Amino acid sequence: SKEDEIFRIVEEKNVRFVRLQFVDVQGIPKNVAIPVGQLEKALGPGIHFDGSSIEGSDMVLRPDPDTFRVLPWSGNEGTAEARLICDIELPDGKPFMGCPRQVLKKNMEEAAKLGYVMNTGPEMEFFLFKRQDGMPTNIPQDRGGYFDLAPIDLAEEIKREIVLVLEEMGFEVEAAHHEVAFGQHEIDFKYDNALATADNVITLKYVAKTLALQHGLHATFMPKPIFGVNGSGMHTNTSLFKDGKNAFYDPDAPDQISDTLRYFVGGVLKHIRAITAITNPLVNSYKRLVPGYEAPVYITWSGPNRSSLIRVPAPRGNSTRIEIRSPDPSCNPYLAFAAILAAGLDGVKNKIEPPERVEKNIYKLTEEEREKLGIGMLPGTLKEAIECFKEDELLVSALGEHVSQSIINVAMADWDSYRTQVHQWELDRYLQTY
Amino acid sequence: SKEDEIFRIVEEKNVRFVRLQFVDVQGIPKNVAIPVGQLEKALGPGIHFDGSSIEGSDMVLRPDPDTFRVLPWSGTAEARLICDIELPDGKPFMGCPRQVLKKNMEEAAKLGYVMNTGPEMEFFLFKRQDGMPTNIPQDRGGYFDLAPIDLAEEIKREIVLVLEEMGFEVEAAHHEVAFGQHEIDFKYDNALATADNVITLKYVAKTLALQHGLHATFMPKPIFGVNGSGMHTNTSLFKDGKNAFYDPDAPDQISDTLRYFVGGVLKHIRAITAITNPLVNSYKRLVPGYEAPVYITWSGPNRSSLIRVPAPRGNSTRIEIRSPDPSCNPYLAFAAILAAGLDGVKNKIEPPERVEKNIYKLTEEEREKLGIGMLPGTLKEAIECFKEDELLVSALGEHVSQSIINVAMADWDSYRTQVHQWELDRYLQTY
Amino acid sequence: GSKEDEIFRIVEEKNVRFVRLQFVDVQGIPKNVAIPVGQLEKALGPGIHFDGSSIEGSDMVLRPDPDTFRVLPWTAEARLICDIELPDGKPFMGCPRQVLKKNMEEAAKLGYVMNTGPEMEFFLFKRQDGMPTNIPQDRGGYFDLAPIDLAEEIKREIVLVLEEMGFEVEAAHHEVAFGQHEIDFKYDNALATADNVITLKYVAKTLAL
Ligand SMILES: [Mg+2]
Ligand SMILES: [Mg+2]
């Protein structure tokens, strides 16, 4: 069985400690390290812990046997370490609704009842910065540009190690390359189910940050670490499958795009202002949603030639898909995919027609011509997105009252602290003159 | 005449250069230095210059003879003249803040109304490191503290002395709550003379602080976590020489004119905030836990509301508007309070009920029950309210109103896109 | 009144330009409102208004005591110890000076008058980078003489400045600890002595700086 396979890998690789991984509402990885002697107890009745960490009391860690992986960084004296992604459940046995992984599982099960399965293939952007006096900085390690090659791209050895470590954990990567900004990089993931992809996103962040520290560097998935340069985004390539076949493909329809694609796009665009609170959750995420950079700011959908919020690429057949370009890599992937699934399926169910495709360059258009087409804007601040998310009854019910309230409480605690602060820009702009 | 008196003071004090002072829409003092030989030309046909500096094209400087003063820092001596801006043809430039206040005062004078203002000017005195100003307090003093706890007594003594040498009367000066913070309380005078005096104080305080290797700043919130600098404007309205705010037969000896004036100011207070609190930093001062008002309420002396009604009666009857900060343009600020206050008197606008309870101590559910509004939270939020206020846009003129909106939104669009250090401190290590 | 006429004579004679309306909070820390000499007539008449929240640690009037007008020996500056009253005119019972005045008036009803002569001990420490320290300026002992007592000029200046303000000291000497000193005060009524104690602390800290 899978438990017997785990114990054979334990004896083979000499695993002595196991990490019971899990994530809080903010997407930050948390864990409980247990010696290998307690692994039988973990896979059976489960390990007890304090659930106050998830929000931002007594509960049980339920390891997923399919997620057992040996960490490739070999420990001291030939001893090895292993990890297990866990689901949280209450002492009675019921699943705890505040767990982000359980929320995505619920939403996927609701989609499975109607024969729908969503596949996600995210484009993970990140920065590799230098360290000064043991603390991380926002100084790029390299001064490279778009798709640059070494010695212009100095982070080729570390990126090579990241993809190698991921392959050693049942993770297949499509491609990796240097991005527009200095020290910025991207790792494009292969398509997989929403749960496996979200598990993979968390693993990548953990591996990238761990291997960066090994080389005296700091990897960050922050949306906008440096002003004036491109920000890190998570473009989520999304495809919906109904009974094994691609629900987004119709060979007889115009552009070979099915009605299900248009209704899915219409549903996502209807709740996109609310989804932004989940997919762009930090105060810094709105410093990325500014014009002049790769990131979408206006609420439009179009073909491949124009860069918009939702982009429908050329590939057809089983590769028919949409690309939601608004999220950033700092979002909780479990919640981001659950929110996209719930909004997209509501569009398919209620037959929500999306607005007309804006093929023209939206950035070049004047502010007068945008209102005429009914073009909207993504939220400008975190408070503005949280206010829209609070009123979206669909997403609050899809994520649950526990997760939704925790997102609002953490975001408003950060906002209230950020708004009262006196930033250096104000001293630079007003201290000498006034 | 006044021109003959000017030339007598010139020959007596040996004045060799005169500064033709004026201010832009942001309240920053600007000037044209001319040698004394050109003083006759300035007082007669006027000196020409480029008026695009007021925005932030050609015009003439019209010196006000009543504002001729010799600068006490002996050079040969120097003198100054506050100027009004006029177009080459002779008509007044509506974009000049001083002319805007003068208009609004002339409109009030037609109705027999004269507004007297006595502002409480708060400011900070910071150290200078490597020739550049800092936000490090020079002293570690508190509220009303005395030397050696208040190390800025000689600089303050020197400020009030220099002001007295320029026909300026100060009521009192003291150390404020925050470290290195101080306050200079001015006495009552007409809105124009008071606004001229406010600009002079900022110029003198900053000049004298540089002489002592320090930096004086009128910034609303230079340091996070400590009290911010405010400009509490003690306001009194006079009708035909008598105090229009006093009525001995009315309850609490408050005339109906006071109530209607307060009602008018509170109706347009969200829009006035764009003028009286014009910087992005001004909204970091409008936060709870400090002396600055945040909720839109008016009350008696014991409670600290947006508008206060102090105990003194008779000719000293007055209100205290405590929302403005010392970074505002005083000419435009007093014009906005006069226009809003007079609209309340004209249209008989009844103010809301007095909130005598401590507003900060009440919970949000209690504040919601009493219907207490809040001042704008951001500069963008106040400018949106100012854009819709047709009264204030017409009182300040389409030229001044548009310049305020253009400068504020240029600062807001630059500030909102910036990545501040708080974000790196809160997200860089974890994400 | 005549005491007021006396004050304005000293103002023109010594060229006083600013006056400090001194007062004290519940903790004994001296507080003041600096007013230009033009407002001195307003202070001695209807009084100067201020915020009474400082006395605790919101609107009151400063009532200067004309007998406490003294020119600061360091254009000249002058001081006036003030009593606090509420805007209506009643004395504020939160003012420490008014509290001692009350208790003395009760004692005066029973024909009793208390005289106090305190022995004021203090330390004179060095300053490092403009901030105060607890490092003794001198390495002297009990009743020591210079050069063992380095603070003899500062103590001489303190007593000289006090004498120039209608203040008489009995004796001064170095104390047991390093950099410690004592100034023994002459006998006087509780109010005058308390006014004198506040003045000594202000003068000693000012001359030390
Ligand atoms: Mg993309
Ligand atoms: Mg006040």
PDB file of C-alpha atoms and ligand atoms in Angstrom, chain A residues 123 125 146 179 186 188 234-237 294 311 321 323-325, ligand 1:
ATOM      1  CA  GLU A 123       4.513  30.813 -14.750  1.00  0.00           C
ATOM      2  CA  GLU A 125       8.452  34.746 -11.530  1.00  0.00           C
ATOM      3  CA  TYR A 146      14.955  39.252 -20.955  1.00  0.00           C
ATOM      4  CA  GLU A 179      13.145  37.756 -17.018  1.00  0.00           C
ATOM      5  CA  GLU A 186      10.880  32.585 -14.275  1.00  0.00           C
ATOM      6  CA  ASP A 188       7.253  27.668 -16.132  1.00  0.00           C
ATOM      7  CA  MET A 234       2.162  34.331 -11.566  1.00  0.00           C
ATOM      8  CA  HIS A 235       0.422  33.888 -14.930  1.00  0.00           C
ATOM      9  CA  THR A 236      -1.912  30.888 -14.396  1.00  0.00           C
ATOM     10  CA  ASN A 237      -2.495  28.896 -17.607  1.00  0.00           C
ATOM     11  CA  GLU A 294       4.108  43.379 -18.066  1.00  0.00           C
ATOM     12  CA  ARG A 311      -5.297  35.985 -22.842  1.00  0.00           C
ATOM     13  CA  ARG A 321      -6.593  27.170 -22.569  1.00  0.00           C
ATOM     14  CA  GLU A 323      -4.014  32.631 -19.282  1.00  0.00           C
ATOM     15  CA  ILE A 324      -5.028  34.666 -16.215  1.00  0.00           C
ATOM     16  CA  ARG A 325      -2.177  37.167 -15.924  1.00  0.00           C
TER      17      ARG A 325
HETATM   18 MG    MG D   1       2.482  34.830 -19.520  1.00  0.00          MG
END
